[PDB]
Design a protein around this ligand. Structure first.
Ligand code: XZY
Length: 119
């Protein structure tokens, strides 16, 4: 029932994500000289450095907010991909499965801790 524990849990999960080869396309923003049309399609960019920085700044209030931003990384990849069989998109799907597998307990524990706080 520790309503702060999610923050270190998210830091550790982000550390795992940065160690994963599949995260490499998603660790920083998109060079427009490499993907000129990127910001025609994607009006709300997100990457794992921005998520980590937002967390470390104290600018997430809950793991739900962090989860929203991580999911935006994946939805951006799905929206920008020219194909379901794109290498970078395929990396996004594996990393998303890994992230969802790990964030599930963080969200459950936070929400349970907040319900106990308000009991
Ligand atoms: O350029 C980058 N990342 C920045 C880096 F290269 F510095 F790491 N991306 C390429 C475009 N992105 C996609 O999600 C995507 C889906 C299908 C195809 Cl193709 O791209 C985002 C990641």
């Amino acid at each position: 029932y520790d309503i702060q524990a999610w923050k270190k849990q998210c830091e550790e999960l982000l550390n795992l994500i940065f160690q994963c080869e599949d995260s490499e396309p998603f660790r920083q923003p998109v060079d427009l000289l490499e993907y000129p049309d990127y910001r025609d399609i994607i009006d709300t960019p997100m990457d794992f450095a921005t998520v980590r920085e937002t967390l470390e700044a104290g600018n997430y209030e809950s793991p739900m907010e962090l989860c929203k931003d991580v999911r935006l990384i994946f939805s951006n990849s799905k929206a920008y991909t020219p194909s379901k069989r794109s290498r970078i998109y395929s990396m996004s799907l594996r990393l998303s499965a890994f992230f969802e597998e790990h964030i599930s307990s963080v969200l459950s524990d936070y929400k349970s801790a907040l319900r106990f706080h308000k009991r």
